[PDB]
Design a protein around this ligand. Structure first.
Ligand SMILES: Nc1nc2c(ncn2[C@@H]2O[C@H](COP(=O)(O)OP(=O)(O)OP(=O)(O)O)[C@@H](O)[C@H]2O)c(=O)[nH]1
Ligand SMILES: Nc1ncnc2c1ncn2[C@@H]1O[C@H](COP(=O)(O)OP(=O)(O)CP(=O)(O)O)[C@@H](O)[C@H]1O
Ligand SMILES: Nc1nc2c(ncn2[C@@H]2O[C@H](COP(=O)(O)OP(=O)(O)O)[C@@H](O)[C@H]2O)c(=O)[nH]1
Ligand SMILES: CS(=O)(=O)NCCc1ccc(F)cc1
Ligand SMILES: [Ca+2]
Ligand SMILES: [Ca+2]
Ligand SMILES: [Ca+2]
Ligand SMILES: [Mg+2]
Ligand SMILES: [Mg+2]
Ligand SMILES: [Mg+2]
Lengths: 425, 352, 54, 438
């Protein structure tokens, strides 16, 4: 009974989190009303990891929906599986965060955070043995970025020895809402460096390019981007939601994926990514070739620019586990220049029998690559292009922040970039 | 795409093999410390065999046989011949040898003097030679007192063996020489003898009444090119190849290189390698081995071939690098990692 | 090739063949190690809370 | 009669323990409910099988075993499995969250909180013994519990049972059946702190068992069940002398006397043959010479290494089935004249032979085929130091960059313990080289 407490904050956080529960609820045979209707016992073996069991054989997601404005969560509550969430687990304000990290972290967010922790404490107290927490949010806004990292800081204080995990959507000028997104992302990244054990970096530009070039979607929407995130979040959590010879809880994964405490930012990947030739059976080689292809990765970082510290691949569906090892052992032994040679056997593979809905087989990719420094370099450059002229700073100094804190976020980010660089040589 | 590493930069042979492997476009070289390799061109000394064959899904191959030093060490070879029943102590193609440890350190000092006094008393030629593996340090003399005293002044194991006082001398010149045969043993323990040998000849007239000047007694390519005043006179680089040497044997001795010398050479190579096959074979091992050997022979005026030593990390004759190295890639490397004639070797069949 | 100490019973037998002749920390100290590591954990955690309190 | 207590620590220890006791019961005619019709002494007796089984008044034969794991999912299989009736609840100890493959977490953080409870349960089994021989401890090198908690348990067993022998069955880490990257750290840390507390240790390299299952049993992708039933045959061959009438290795002490002349060098190599696939149409039955000759093939060694380039210190041949001393010595003569067997000069060149007439028992529905005779050779070769070399090298690659070290320091371990442990292994490798190489 290794329970995980899920939290979703802000617009992006709640929209991506909603689809995630939609996807995995379908995989575990849970309908929108919480009743189970699957045909395999595997669907329930680990159901208590993400769902609570209520009266009448009802399964309620262990999820807490947080936002500083009602709009997004009114959509969830009216969405497909909106009725499945515990009503008490909706915590929201009315002021909004105005895409302002200071408002989410120091002013508006502070006024609401204590009541969020009351719900978190409630869900934790009922866990037999709490694995840890997982947060979904963006870094470019105000609530998910500012209040999200405030929540993490206050969760780590009250649960210092529990694992803190996040899915963090990184901003990109190509898929942008406001110009202050580099400010909010740089301020959040430092909080994550300090207070998260694992962070899956999701770059909206990578999601966009995939919908545009690979999926051949003429006009991508946030909905399209969120379909990729749902599928990827379901893939990375397969290790936790189903049985297998691997076991693996959050702390065991972190112990094998994070060789240094600050370098815990992962690049996820998924395969297949097909356009509507969609019924063609996909062979193991094609799953492996795409899963490692950069065009299938969602951090917008060319892995061939850095080195993999650790790599975890999860294959789903009825396939040849002997042929899986062969293709995996082929990619490594064919590109051993992009794997650090001072972590023996840093490429692990796991197979799951239940495939995602609508696919005979799939593969999810989890890489701890020093190439991620390119993502942080982009954010840093955009931050400094505005901060050197103090552009838009008044939105933040008006909330009580000082220029020094920005200077410190800049140095903290450039240090992180320097730390990745030394392990790339 | 096959992968290989290089852990001996001083190997002229495998510098060419590596240069050929890359030229095929199907072999990729990795850093010398990358464990994910198919082929290791390993170091000469302290090669870590225990770390081979433990990478999942990687068939790993190395260019050295673990345990073959027993054959490529001066003292080791002597002990192997005297202690192995397949070769016996009465082995007829190996000069009478004795292992002699310096007194500042089993040892065969008393056994040597016994056979020495027997020769001295019987009027027989009693000229011996002392040498070791730590030499470039050789001494030739007919007095047992000088041979033993020379070894005590050193600090490593030495070997004293009978000096062939009746060597076969080429004409014109009246000059000594030795024969180098290259032998390749693949993972299946086939014994392939390279069809091309080299006679490393002395450019000085052999003088039996003066073992002090060792230029006419030692046929090493380095000694002749440094202390000899007739280097390159009769043949380029004091190297005569089998085509010429065979033509000479026909003109002078009315015999052929095959009949008079090569039969004994092929026999000696087989006996030496078959003897240690159960000790070094990799037939049922978790990794695979091959290795290039350099056998050095002596020929006396009776056309009898004697084994001098076996080199485990031999070099090749400049003219024969291209042909031999390519041959190593064909029968030793591509036989295990095939790519996408008239073999240059001579297979010496045997019972495994 | 000699056989020595041949012992036979209803369920088997055993013997010996020679081919050739020849030629702690106290309970107290363990508690200190355990408690010393527990103390270093408490220290590191206090420094975490001190950092968070700032 | 003297009793042996088996301790199973961590997933690998518990699942291997489950396979052994399954086999022990089939070998001794014990049913899943603990009944043993052939035992004419009800609720008592000092027979050889009583070294491993106690008896209740109701005639239940109960393993003298304790299962310990910091997480309950593996031991829950025992609580509800086929042989659930054998054990009682006091014997199965489970925590709520494991060591996360972190030696420091199993030794210090979590170990400190459960060590006294485990000693209490073992003390309960000890109080049932009239003359306890010692302990057989099963664990993995890589697991956080198997590595970290085992070393702690061994330290306390030496304190509470000073004069008792301790043998290990340790699983050497193999990347083919492992998803953990830090197992070299755990293996070296647990070997360092356990070395002076274990009298004799049988290492099983998962890589060796894995290839045997693919090569001999034609299993393209073996599972832990496949790996464990094969391992429990080797374990049974090694413990049979303690559980059956005999004169060789009749008590745990004899294992050290026959296999370990030097204390630190206490890791005998195990070689087993024949392993024949059950799915075969029908195999030709191998002779005493052929299976004895097979004991010197690297393909059926529990740890892949080349004994031709080591030196033997001791050699036990344990036969099961149709074997007479006449045929053993005949095959040994042939092997000496063909094999490369070099003993150290300060040890006799000989073999101790034990024969048990009962052939190997095979679990119904298992992978192994019923054979008429099988053998397990226990040889102490310096060649097994190749296993340490491989492991120490991987340790060096990661430790040179302090990779993953923060996870251990975070649980209260000092960084100096890494190097203190590595230097002990460097000394252990030097001991093997001084004994084996000239
Ligand atoms: N042969 C065999 N090896 C196993 C088995 N179970 C785990 N292993 C090996 O043991 C190592 C992992 O250690 P575990 O025993 O699973 O971990 P643990 O002792 O339970 O400690 P934790 O970290 O708390 O889980 C890996 O190298 C596995 O290959 C098993 O049943 N049989
Ligand atoms: N017993 C013997 N009788 C006659 N000549 C001998 C001899 N032992 C050595 N030599 C001479 O010494 C020369 C080489 O000696 P040796 O081979 O022992 O040194 P070395 O090993 O450094 C050269 P390489 O290893 O390349 O063959 C040969 O040319 C040979 O003529
Ligand atoms: N992938 C994805 N990104 C989003 C979505 N909504 C907003 N974003 C991104 O998140 C950032 C805006 O943060 P937002 O969540 O709207 O702010 P918040 O509500 O204050 O937490 C911008 O970089 C957007 O591109 C979404 O539904 N999907
Ligand atoms: C202020 S804006 O530049 O018009 N906003 C565009 C957001 C977006 C862009 C591409 C998407 F696939 C989804 C969303
Ligand atoms: Ca207010
Ligand atoms: Ca009884
Ligand atoms: Ca002791
Ligand atoms: Mg918004
Ligand atoms: Mg030489
Ligand atoms: Mg475990």
């Amino acid at each position: 009974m290794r329970e995980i407490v899920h939290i979703q904050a802000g617009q992006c956080g709640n929209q991506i989190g909603a689809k995630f529960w939609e996807v995995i609820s379908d995989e575990h045979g849970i309908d929108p009303t919480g009743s189970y209707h699957g045909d395999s016992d595997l669907q329930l073996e680990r159901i208590n990891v993400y769902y609570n069991e209520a009266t009448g054989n009802k399964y309620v997601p262990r999820a807490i929906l947080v936002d500083l404005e009602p709009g997004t969560m009114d959509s969830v509550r009216s969405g497909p599986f909106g009725q499945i969430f515990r009503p008490d687990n909706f915590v929201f304000g009315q002021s909004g965060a105005g895409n302002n990290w200071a408002k989410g972290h120091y002013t508006e967010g502070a006024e609401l955070v204590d009541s969020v922790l009351d719900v978190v404490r409630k869900e934790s107290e009922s866990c037999d043995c709490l694995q840890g927490f997982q947060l979904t949010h963006s870094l470019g806004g105000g609530t998910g970025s500012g209040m999200g990292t405030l929540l993490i800081s206050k969760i780590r204080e009250e649960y210092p020895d529990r694992i803190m995990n996040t899915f963090s959507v990184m901003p990109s000028p190509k898929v942008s809402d406001t110009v202050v997104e580099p400010y909010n992302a740089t301020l959040s990244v430092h909080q994550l460096v300090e207070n998260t054990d694992e962070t899956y970096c999701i770059d909206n530009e990578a999601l966009y390019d995939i919908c545009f070039r690979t999926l051949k979607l003429t006009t991508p929407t946030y909905g399209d981007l969120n379909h990729l995130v749902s599928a990827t979040m379901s893939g990375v959590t397969t290790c936790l939601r189903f049985p297998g010879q691997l076991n693996a809880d959050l702390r065991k994964l972190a112990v094998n994926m994070v060789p240094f405490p600050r370098l815990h930012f992962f690049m996820p990947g998924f395969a297949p990514l097909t356009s509507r030739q969609q019924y063609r059976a996909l062979t193991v080689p094609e799953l492996t070739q795409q899963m490692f292809d950069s065009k299938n990765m969602m951090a917008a970082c060319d892995p061939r620019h850095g080195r993999y510290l650790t790599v975890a691949a999860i294959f789903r569906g009825r396939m040849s586990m002997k042929e899986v090892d062969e293709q995996m052992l082929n990619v490594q032994n064919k590109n051993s220049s992009y794997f650090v040679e001072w972590i023996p056997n840093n490429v692990k593979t796991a197979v799951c029998d239940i495939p995602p809905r609508g696919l005979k087989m799939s593969a999810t990719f989890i890489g701890n690559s020093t190439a991620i420094q390119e993502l942080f370099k982009r954010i840093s450059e955009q931050f400094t292009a505005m901060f050197r002229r103090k552009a838009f700073l008044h939105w933040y100094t008006g909330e009580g922040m000082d220029e020094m804190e920005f200077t410190e976020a800049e140095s903290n980010m450039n240090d992180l970039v320097s730390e990745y660089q030394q392990y790339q040589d | 795409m096959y992968t290989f590493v290089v852990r001996d930069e001083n190997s002229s042979v495998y510098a060419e093999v590596s240069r050929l492997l890359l030229a095929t476009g199907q072999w990729k070289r990795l850093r010398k410390d990358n464990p994910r390799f198919n082929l290791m061109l390993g170091e000469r000394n302290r090669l870590p065999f225990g770390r081979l064959g433990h990478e999942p899904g990687l068939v790993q191959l190395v260019n050295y046989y673990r345990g073959a030093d027993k054959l490529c060490r001066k003292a080791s070879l002597v002990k192997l011949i005297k202690t192995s029943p397949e070769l016996s102590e009465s082995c007829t193609w190996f000069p009478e040898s004795y292992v002699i440890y310096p007194t500042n350190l089993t040892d065969e000092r008393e056994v040597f003097l016994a056979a020495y006094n027997r020769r001295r008393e019987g009027r027989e030629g009693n000229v011996w030679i002392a040498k070791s593996s730590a030499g470039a340090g050789i001494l030739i003399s007919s007095e047992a007192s000088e041979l033993l005293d020379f070894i005590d002044e050193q600090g490593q194991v030495h070997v004293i063996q009978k000096y062939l006082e009746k060597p076969l001398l080429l004409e014109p010149g009246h000059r000594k020489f030795d024969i180098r045969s290259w032998v390749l043993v693949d993972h299946l323990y086939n014994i392939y003898l390279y069809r091309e040998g080299v006679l490393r000849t002395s450019s000085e007239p052999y003088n039996s009444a003066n073992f002090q000047d060792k230029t006419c007694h030692l046929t090493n390519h380095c000694i002749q090119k440094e202390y000899s005043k007739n280097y390159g006179r009769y043949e380029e680089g004091n190297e005569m190849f089998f085509e010429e040497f065979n033509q000479y044997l026909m003109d002078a001795l009315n015999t052929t290189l095959e009949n008079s010398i090569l039969l004994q050479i092929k026999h000696i190579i087989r006996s030496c390698l078959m003897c240690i096959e159960p000790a070094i074979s990799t037939k049922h091992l978790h990794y695979q081995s091959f290795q290039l050997f350099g056998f050095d022979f002596m020929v006396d005026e009776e056309l009898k071939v004697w084994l001098i030593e076996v080199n485990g990390a031999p070099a090749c004759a400049q003219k024969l690098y291209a042909e031999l190295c390519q041959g190593i890639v064909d029968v030793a490397i591509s036989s295990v990692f095939p790519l996408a004639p008239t073999s240059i070797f001579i297979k010496l069949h045997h019972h495994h | 090739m000699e056989v020595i100490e041949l012992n036979k019973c209803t369920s088997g037998q055993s013997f010996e063949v020679i081919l050739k002749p020849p030629s702690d920390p106290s309970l107290e100290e363990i508690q200190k190690k355990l408690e010393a590591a527990e103390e270093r954990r408490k220290y590191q955690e206090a420094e975490l809370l001190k950092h968070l309190a700032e | 009669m003297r009793e042996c207590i088996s301790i199973h620590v961590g997933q690998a220890g518990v699942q291997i323990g489950n396979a052994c006791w399954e086999l022990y019961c089939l070998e001794h005619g014990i049913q899943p409910d603990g009944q043993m019709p052939s035992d004419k002494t009800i609720g008592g007796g000092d027979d050889s099988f009583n070294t491993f089984f106690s008896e209740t008044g109701a005639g239940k034969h109960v393993p003298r075993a304790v299962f310990v794991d910091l997480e309950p999912t593996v031991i829950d299989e025992v609580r509800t499995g086929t042989y659930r009736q054998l054990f009682h609840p006091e014997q199965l100890i489970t925590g709520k969250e494991d060591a996360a493959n972190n030696y420091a977490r199993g030794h210090y953080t979590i170990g400190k909180e459960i060590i006294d409870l485990v000693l209490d349960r073992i003390r309960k089994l000890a109080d049932q013994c009239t003359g306890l021989q010692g302990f057989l401890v099963f664990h993995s090198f890589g697991g956080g519990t198997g590595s970290g908690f085992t070393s702690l348990l061994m330290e306390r067993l030496s304190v509470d049972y000073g004069k008792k022998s301790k043998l290990e069955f340790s699983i050497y880490p193999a990347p083919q059946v492992s998803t953990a990257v830090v197992e070299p750290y755990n293996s070296i840390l647990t070997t360092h702190t356990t070395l002076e507390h274990s009298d004799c240790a049988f290492m099983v390299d998962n890589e060796a068992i894995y290839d045997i299952c693919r090569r001999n049993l034609d299993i393209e992708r073996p599972t832990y069940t496949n790996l464990n039933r094969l391992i429990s045959q080797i374990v049974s061959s090694i413990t049979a002398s303690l559980r059956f009438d005999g004169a060789l290795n009749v008590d745990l002490t004899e294992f050290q006397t026959n296999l370990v002349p030097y204390p630190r060098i206490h890791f005998p190599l195990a070689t087993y043959a024949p392993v024949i696939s059950a799915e075969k149409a029908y195999h030709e039955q191998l002779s005493v010479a052929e299976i004895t000759n097979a004991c010197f093939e690297p393909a059926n060694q529990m740890v892949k290494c080349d004994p031709r380039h080591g030196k033997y210190m001791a050699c036990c041949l344990l036969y099961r089935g149709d074997v007479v001393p006449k045929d053993v010595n005949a095959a040994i003569a042939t092997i000496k004249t063909k094999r490369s067997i070099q003993f150290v000069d300060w040890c006799p060149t000989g073999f101790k032979v034990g024969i048990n007439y009962q052939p190997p028992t095979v679990v119904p529905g298992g992978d192994l085929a019923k054979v008429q005779r099988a053998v397990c050779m226990l040889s102490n070769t310096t060649a097994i130091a190749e296993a340490w070399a491989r492991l120490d090298h991987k340790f060096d690659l990661m430790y040179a960059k302090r990779a993953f070290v923060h996870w251990y320091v975070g649980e209260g371990m000092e960084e100096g313990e890494f190097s203190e442990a590595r230097e002990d292994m460097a000394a252990l490798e030097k001991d093997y080289e001084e004994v084996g190489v000239d």
